[PDB]
């Protein structure tokens, strides 16, 4: 009934509300804005002594990288808040509520992703207003939203399941960071070394951790039919597992 739905949404509202009140959020936004403005101002308009013309695509990709990381950390905090304060015990009292808890968090993750995508959009629009160059297609920004939604929801639900499996929070933040910064590190470090190097590299296109992390610094994207399906399928199964698990795990 709508009463159930209402209670679920009320929890969502509080998590988002918190994001918009903590000064930390505001700080993080200012940091991103500063870094982007810095790149634009310092060299995009000056390195080759151009007549102040820049590549928004370079800015775009950098902004995405930063916001996806900050976003993922916001997602992790959203996920771990109840384990941290121990308040989870007050929610998981019956199946209807336990399931609603997962639903609420899933919704919050989606809304966080939307927020970050909106920030990304705004930062880049300001850059476009500020200098010269051909503006990016609206549809490019839209596809960027899709990337954010998928990236963050995939990692969010994955980490959520782990959080519930272990009931630890320190290692969730650790994994969020670790996974993001390991793919781009390890690829060029050793992928080329084994006789299976090419095999391994090709394999990454079918592994969401690898391809979603790699695309975090791309100016654009185009998922292959398989790659698209695999990522979305992974999201669906994690969601399902979270439900099946929460329904059985003692708190």
């Amino acid at each position: 009934v709508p009463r159930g739905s209402h209670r679920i949404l009320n929890l969502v509202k509080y998590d988002l509300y918190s994001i918009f009140k903590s000064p930390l959020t505001y700080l993080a936004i200012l940091v991103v804005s500063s870094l982007i403005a810095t790149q634009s101002i310092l060299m995009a308009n000056s390195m080759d002594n151009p007549k102040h013309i820049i590549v928004y695509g370079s800015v775009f990709a950098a902004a995405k990288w930063l916001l996806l990381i900050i976003g993922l950390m916001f997602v992790v905090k959203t996920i771990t808040r109840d384990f941290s304060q121990g308040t989870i015990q007050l929610y998981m009292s019956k199946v209807k509520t336990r399931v609603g808890y997962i639903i609420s968090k899933t919704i919050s993750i989606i809304l966080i992703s939307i927020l970050f995508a909106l920030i990304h959009y705004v930062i880049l629009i300001v850059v476009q207003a500020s200098s010269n160059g051909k503006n990016l297609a609206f549809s490019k920004y839209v596809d960027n939203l899709w990337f954010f939604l998928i990236f963050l929801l995939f990692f969010g639900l994955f980490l959520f399941l782990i959080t519930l499996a272990s009931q630890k929070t320190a290692m969730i933040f650790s994994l969020g960071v670790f996974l993001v910064l390991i793919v781009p590190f390890i690829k060029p470090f050793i992928t080329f070394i084994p006789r299976y190097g090419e095999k391994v590299l090709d394999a990454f296109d079918y592994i969401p951790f690898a391809y979603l992390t790699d695309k975090m610094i791309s100016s654009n994207f185009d998922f292959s039919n398989w790659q698209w399906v695999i990522s979305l399928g992974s999201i669906v199964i994690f969601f399902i597992l979270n439900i099946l698990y929460v329904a059985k795990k003692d708190i």
Partner: protein, 290 residues
């Protein structure tokens, strides 16, 4: 809220064993037992924080259950008031300002309700936690030592407030608690849990007091004093560890003191007073350790 044949073990440690429970048209049920018996476990099963209890937990899920288990659960960087609003909106039906205020002022937490929880004392956190549970405007309230950290006055006002509320709302309250004296303030029955099952069902409808007299003797005189008193008066309870024998109240101590003197027994103490859950408790549990 009924429990049928509940059995729960942790590995080889059986905590609950075929334990049954209900509210026989009662409203306030106290739960008494020693530490390690399983009071929290029972409450968790009822709350539904356990799904491995091998038995039937009969709950009309249409109803709300409010509860407080072990240490209080609050969001530390938020105000007390914030937590009340959140839970009312989140676990409850919605935030009822008037209801909330009655609880805040009845508990007397008002002066610090707008301060952050991390700045609260243990006592303050418990007063708030009780209120948080109440904010769901539940029918079943389950409290794990609700006055554990409260001061003498806090305990009385909080407990009194809850009793008022059980009529305002059609509630059933389960209170697991030490401080039998607090249970005695607000109760209409109590159950004594031992070795995974209920041992006594103690019903109390009125403050009948069942006045009793305590006669206290040296441990070397306990056996013969017990024999004398049980044969000539009505023995109600004993506390072997402390040398107490409890008989039906006597106005006049002469007959007992003379008869004991003829047996070369001279009490360390004697007094007429009201009956208590404490005496009931010791009679049942003292032999574990003593």
């Amino acid at each position: 809220m009924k429990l049928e044949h509940i059995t729960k073990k942790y590995g080889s440690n059986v905590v609950l064993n075929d334990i049954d429970f209900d509210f026989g048209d009662s409203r306030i049920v106290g739960l008494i037992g020693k530490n390690g018996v399983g009071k929290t476990t029972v409450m968790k099963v009822m709350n539904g924080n356990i799904i491995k209890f091998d038995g039937k937990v009969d709950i009309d899920n249409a109803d709300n259950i409010g509860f407080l288990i072990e240490h209080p659960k609050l969001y530390d960087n938020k105000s007390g008031l914030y937590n009340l609003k959140l839970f009312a909106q989140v676990l409850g039906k919605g935030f009822d300002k008037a209801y909330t205020d009655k609880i805040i002022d009845a508990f007397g937490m008002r002066p610090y309700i707008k301060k952050k929880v991390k700045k609260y004392s243990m006592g303050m956190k418990q007063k708030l936690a009780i209120a948080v549970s109440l904010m769901n405007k539940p029918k079943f309230l389950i409290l794990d030592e609700p006055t554990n950290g409260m001061d003498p006055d806090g305990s009385i006002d909080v407990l009194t407030t809850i009793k008022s509320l059980v009529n305002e709302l059609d509630m059933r309250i389960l209170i697991s608690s030490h401080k039998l004296e607090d249970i005695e303030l607000i109760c209409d029955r109590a159950v004594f849990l031992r070795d995974g099952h209920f041992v006594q069902d103690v019903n109390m409808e009125e403050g009948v007091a069942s006045d009793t007299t305590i006669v206290t003797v040296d441990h070397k005189d306990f056996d013969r004093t017990e024999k004398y008193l049980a044969e000539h008066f009505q023995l109600q309870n004993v506390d072997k560890a402390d040398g107490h024998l409890m008989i039906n109240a006597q106005k006049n101590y002469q007959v007992i003191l003379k008869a004991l003197s003829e047996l070369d027994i001279y009490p360390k103490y004697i007094e007429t007073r009201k009956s208590s859950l404490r005496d009931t408790y010791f009679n049942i549990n003292q032999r574990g350790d003593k």
